Amino acid sequence: PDINIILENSLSPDATLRHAAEQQLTHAAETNFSQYLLTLVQALANESSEGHIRAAAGIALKNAFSAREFARQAALQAKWLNQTDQETRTRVKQLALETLASPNSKAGQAAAQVIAAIAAIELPRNQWPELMHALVRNASEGGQHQKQASLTAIGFICETQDTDLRNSLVGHSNAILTAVVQGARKEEPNNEVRFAAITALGDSLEFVGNNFKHEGERNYIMQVVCEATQAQDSRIQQGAFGCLNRIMALYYEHMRYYMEKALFGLTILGMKSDDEDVAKLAVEFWSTVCEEEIAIEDDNAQVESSEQMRPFYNFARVATNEVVPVLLQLLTKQDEDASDDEYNISRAAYQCLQLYAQAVGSTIIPPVIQFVEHNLRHADWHFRDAAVSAFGAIMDGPEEKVLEPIVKTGMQPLIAMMEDESIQVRDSTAYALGRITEACSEAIDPNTHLEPLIRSLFNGLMNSPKMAASCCWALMNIAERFAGEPGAAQNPLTPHFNQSVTNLLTVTAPMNGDSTVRTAAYEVLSVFVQNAANDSLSAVASLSTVILQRLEETLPLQQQVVSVEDKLILEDMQTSLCTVLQATVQRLDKEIAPQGDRIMQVLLQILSTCGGKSSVPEGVFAAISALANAMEEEFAKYMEAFAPFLYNALGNQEEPSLCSMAIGLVSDVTRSLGERSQPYCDNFMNYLLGNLRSTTLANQFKPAILQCFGDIASAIGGHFETYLTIVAQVLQQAATITAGPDGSYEMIDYVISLREGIMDAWGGIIGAMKTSNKTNVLQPYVESIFALLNSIANDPNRSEALMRASMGVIGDLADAYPNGQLADAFRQDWITAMIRETRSNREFGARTIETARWAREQVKRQIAG
């Protein structure tokens, strides 16, 4: 009754009464948790209540002692274990179990969720010994709904990726597998049961298959799945194909026999189904195959020894002649009405086609080219659009050499497609041209195709918003690919540069145009500037003034902001303008100096009006960083005005992204200004050291902060002795932070990044103490430096930057203590091995290998005193 109204209000669209209800529930769970549980499970078990109420009760009950988040989950589970009595637990368990039999599907499903949540707690501790036997019995003997719900509960329990729960289930493995497979068979008269069973099998794959190691279980599962894919019922088909997709994703290596035997034909049939949902799943099957094989191809490529090769069966390659024509056919099933990023069959097919091209390379070209030639001039826009889409789709993957003559042949017709009636065809054409430029710019000859290509893309950008993004993307690719050589006076786009800048400035000129088009076009302008040649420098200079003028004009615009939309639009404008400004600053370098005063004036004025969640301060900082790098010691005059803004960004960790940017700015300023930045470094150190005081061990800012220590040390030299005791202390502590015996990828990466920071820090410090003739005061820390060097050497987890920095420090140490004071520590074998490994890695860059060579030489000059 009351709980019915609280639950109904809990689902209410009015957030005031919804939040009110949520508060009532939370309060109820706080005042008497056990009674809260009883009330909810009783409402769930009540056959006189509506399904959605019962489901709501069951969900709330589930959430009373379960959560996705680790810590929440720890706390809530503890509530089930230690804040209930056995009578309440027994009651909740029994009522939940009984509700599985309910003819109301929503109540049954909810009860399955409840049971899974309880099982996750009790089964590892063996506190519900009756459960799995009861579920298996229900799944085999129950009425329709009891079967459905119990199968669902079994699936929920088996899918739970928890080692202890899995292990507790081990003894029930065959009984569970038998129950779900037998439930899924066509001999099962009830289609509802079959769907529940095949779904449960899919959820239980990791568990019941025993990792598919044994042929009997394998054939058992594969037989029923293949059978279910050709079931008359659409839902059963869907469950089957979803199951099949997970099987392929998990057990590719076991699939050869089954692929040849049935999967090939089954998925072909599935892709051509009249039901869009199973068609989607069947296309996804081949997307999964392609993804796997792309990964395998890549891994087997990077491998030196064939014993390291992963099993590879070339499924996609073999299947090309059957699957690709179907995919192309599905490209013609566009829904012009459908929303954006709505995943329909046509976009699914396109994704698959892309992956297919990567997976099989040149093999995909003849069926696609046949399709493109047939349909490029079709009367139905569906087929023309499909044709150009397909063409662009296969640009990334096959041998460039093979594509070059096809691109050359198809360049002019594809450009002509930009004048198609259909806006869909024009958009797909623009994107395809971007794909082409990106993958095969070499095949595009400037003198012949460049000008019309650019003209058509700009024509599209300036007159047709629907294709603006695609045009912008293509244009950016072109600017990137036709950039010319470093130091060059001209590149192919240079005679088009001024016109291009004019066009981009024109389309971004309205204050009422589409904000997304404005943003996209500004990005284009940025990339054009970045890749501009020296003949265009005066134009870039002129552009920087226009951009500056527009930036200045946003300041009174800021004043007119009323709505949140106004705010967002203004912030995108300023962020885009800062991006372009940044581009001109970097491109002009020293030549930017005459506009330095104007730049800092408007940028600081923009900072003073920023606040809250905004992308603007970060863009401003990026532009300022550019100006500091360009003007160097000339930038010092802006430090009086700018430093307090920098300090404030540094001290505010509640804006993580800006804080990180601020730390990067300190590195920029100290490196760009050098010793001229020394008077500000005590303030820097105070903020940096202040940041290090945390309740978080893996402080996200620490790696960059340590790198920053290195830059400051270089800038202030002998001054750094003031900070040596503290910083060395921090560096030594940081060196002990590791991912542990079984760490995540994120923590492994964090530690690699951290140790990059540490090594940079030591590097700057060693240099500072050497040049100030203070190697005596550095001497006590040298042993800890070698210790870390050795730790890095003995850890197969590393980055190129880390090894480079390590080589650098080894060399620095040799310089700092000449005439063989460290000859002993250097002649150690792990040192030599470390350096030799670094110099001999052909995958490393030139900087690193040169640094490794310097390290070797530095070592050698140490051995003999």
Question: What CATH number should be reported for the domain holding residue 559?
Answer: 1.25.10.10
Exposure of 293 in the CB half-sphere (CA atoms within 13 A): 26
- Quick count: other Cβ atoms within 10 Å of Cβ 408? 15
Of 342, 316, 352, 346, give the one whose Cα is nearest residue 329: 346
Of 170, 161, 152, give the one whose Cα is nearest residue 96: 152
Q: What is the dihedral of CA 313, 315, 317, 322, to 10 degrees?
A: 150
Question: The tokens of 73 are what?
Answer: 């989950």
Question: The tokens of 243 are what?
Answer: 């199951």
CB-based burial label for 554 (10 Å; 0-12, 13-18, 19+): buried
What are the Cα distances from residue 743, in Å, to 738, 746, 748, 750? 8, 8, 7, 11
> What residues contact residue 856 under an 8 Å CB cut-off, 6+ apart?
835, 836, 839
Question: The tokens of 310 are what?
Answer: 């992963």
Q: Where are the alpha helices (DSSP H) in 560-655?
A: 564-588, 596-607, 616-631, 639-651
Q: Which residue has the tokens 């794909």?
A: 435
Question: The tokens of 326 are what?
Answer: 């179907």
Q: Where are the alpha helices (DSSP H) in 772-845?
A: 775-778, 782-793, 800-816, 823-826, 829-840
Question: The tokens of 732 are what?
Answer: 């030594």
For residues 141 and 175, is the Cβ–Cβ distance under 8 A? Answer: no
**Long-range Cβ contact pairs of 605-608 (< 8 A, separation 24 or more):** 605/555, 606/551, 606/554, 606/555, 606/574, 607/645
DSSP state of 48: T
One-letter identity of residue 234: S
For residues 769 and 812, is the Cβ–Cβ distance under 8 A? Answer: no
**Total of domains in the chain:** 1
CB-based burial label for 537 (10 Å; 0-12, 13-18, 19+): middle
Question: The tokens of 74 are what?
Answer: 């720890």
Of 506, 516, 431, 401, give the one whose Cα is nearest residue 465: 516
Can you tell me the distance from the alpha carbon of 179 to that of 707, in angstroms, rounded to the nearest whole number?
59
Which stretch of DSSP H or E encloses residue 297?
helix 276-301
Can you tell me the distance from the alpha carbon of 545 to that of 543, in angstroms, rounded to the nearest whole number?
5
For residues 424 and 385, is the Cβ–Cβ distance under 8 A? Answer: yes
DSSP state of 652: -
Q: Which residue has the tokens 């990026």?
A: 622
CB-based burial label for 535 (10 Å; 0-12, 13-18, 19+): middle
State how far Cα 763 lies from the chain centre.
32
Of 142, 162, 61, give the one whose Cα is nearest residue 98: 142
Q: 445 in helix, strand or coil?
A: coil
What are the Cα distances from residue 113, in Å, to 53, 155, 181? 15, 10, 21
- Quick count: other Cβ atoms within 10 Å of Cβ 791? 13
Sign of CA dihedral 617, 618, 619, 622: positive
> What residues contact residue 511 under an 8 Å CB cut-off, 6+ apart?
557
For residues 112 and 158, is the Cβ–Cβ distance under 8 A? Answer: no
Can you tell me the distance from the alpha carbon of 354 to that of 345, in angstroms, rounded to the nearest whole number?
14
> What residues contact residue 598 under an 8 Å CB cut-off, 6+ apart?
548
**How big, in percent rounded to 5, are the helix, strand and coil portions of the chain?**
80, 0, 20
Can you tell me the distance from the alpha carbon of 126 to that of 117, in angstroms, rounded to the nearest whole number?
14
- Quick count: other Cβ atoms within 10 Å of Cβ 52? 15
What are the Cα distances from residue 705, in Å, to 286, 372, 651, 665, 798? 46, 55, 12, 11, 20
Would you put residue 794 in left (φ > 0), alpha (ψ -120 to 50) or beta? alpha
For residues 809 and 785, is the Cβ–Cβ distance under 8 A? Answer: yes
What are the Cα distances from residue 139, in Å, to 178, 222, 244, 456, 670? 10, 20, 22, 63, 70
State how far Cα 472 lies from the chain centre.
23
DSSP state of 666: H
Based on its alpha-carbon atoms, the radius of gyration of the chain, rounded to whole angstroms, reads 33
CB-based burial label for 818 (10 Å; 0-12, 13-18, 19+): middle
Question: The tokens of 818 are what?
Answer: 């000449």
- Quick count: other Cβ atoms within 10 Å of Cβ 413? 14
Per the entry, the structure determination technique was X-ray
Q: Where are the alpha helices (DSSP H) in 674-701?
A: 681-692
Of 293, 287, 205, give the one whose Cα is nearest residue 256: 293
SS (H, E, C) 242-278: HHHHHHHHHHHHHCHHHHHHHHHHHHHHHHCCCCHHH
Question: The tokens of 191 are what?
Answer: 């289609």
Can you tell me the distance from the alpha carbon of 762 to that of 728, in angstroms, rounded to the nearest whole number?
8
Q: Where are the alpha helices (DSSP H) in 680-799?
A: 681-692, 702-716, 721-734, 745-771, 775-778, 782-793
Exposure of 140 in the CB half-sphere (CA atoms within 13 A): 13
For residues 107 and 51, is the Cβ–Cβ distance under 8 A? Answer: yes
Can you tell me the distance from the alpha carbon of 703 to that of 750, in angstroms, rounded to the nearest whole number?
8
For residues 284 and 245, is the Cβ–Cβ distance under 8 A? Answer: yes
For residues 600 and 593, is the Cβ–Cβ distance under 8 A? Answer: no
Question: The tokens of 181 are what?
Answer: 């497979």
Domain residue limits at 115: 1-865
- Quick count: other Cβ atoms within 10 Å of Cβ 644? 12
CB-based burial label for 130 (10 Å; 0-12, 13-18, 19+): exposed
What are the Cα distances from residue 460, in Å, to 164, 426, 505, 576, 658? 59, 8, 15, 21, 36
For residues 530 and 497, is the Cβ–Cβ distance under 8 A? Answer: no
Of 440, 446, 456, give the one whose Cα is nearest residue 495: 446
What are the Cα distances from residue 778, in Å, to 81, 544, 710? 56, 47, 14
Question: The tokens of 757 are what?
Answer: 């920071």
> What residues contact residue 228 under an 8 Å CB cut-off, 6+ apart?
184, 186, 194, 198, 236, 237, 239, 240, 243
Q: Which residue has the tokens 């590892």?
A: 124
- Quick count: other Cβ atoms within 10 Å of Cβ 793? 18
Q: 536 in helix, strand or coil?
A: helix
Based on DSSP, count helices (H) and strands (E) in the chain, helices before strands. Answer: 44, 0
Can you tell me the distance from the alpha carbon of 111 to that of 98, in angstroms, rounded to the nearest whole number?
9
Q: 498 in helix, strand or coil?
A: helix
Can you tell me the distance from the alpha carbon of 284 to that of 262, in angstroms, rounded to the nearest whole number?
17
**Long-range Cβ contact pairs of 242-248 (< 8 A, separation 24 or more):** 242/199, 242/202, 242/281, 243/198, 243/199, 243/201, 243/202, 243/205, 244/285, 245/281, 245/284, 245/285, 245/288, 246/202, 246/205, 247/205, 247/212, 247/221, 247/222, 248/285, 248/288, 248/289, 248/292
What are the Cα distances from residue 661, in Å, to 242, 483, 574, 599? 44, 29, 17, 19
Can you tell me the distance from the alpha carbon of 424 to that of 334, in angstroms, rounded to the nearest whole number?
10
Q: Packing angle between helix 494-507 and helix 515-530, nearest 10 degrees?
A: 160
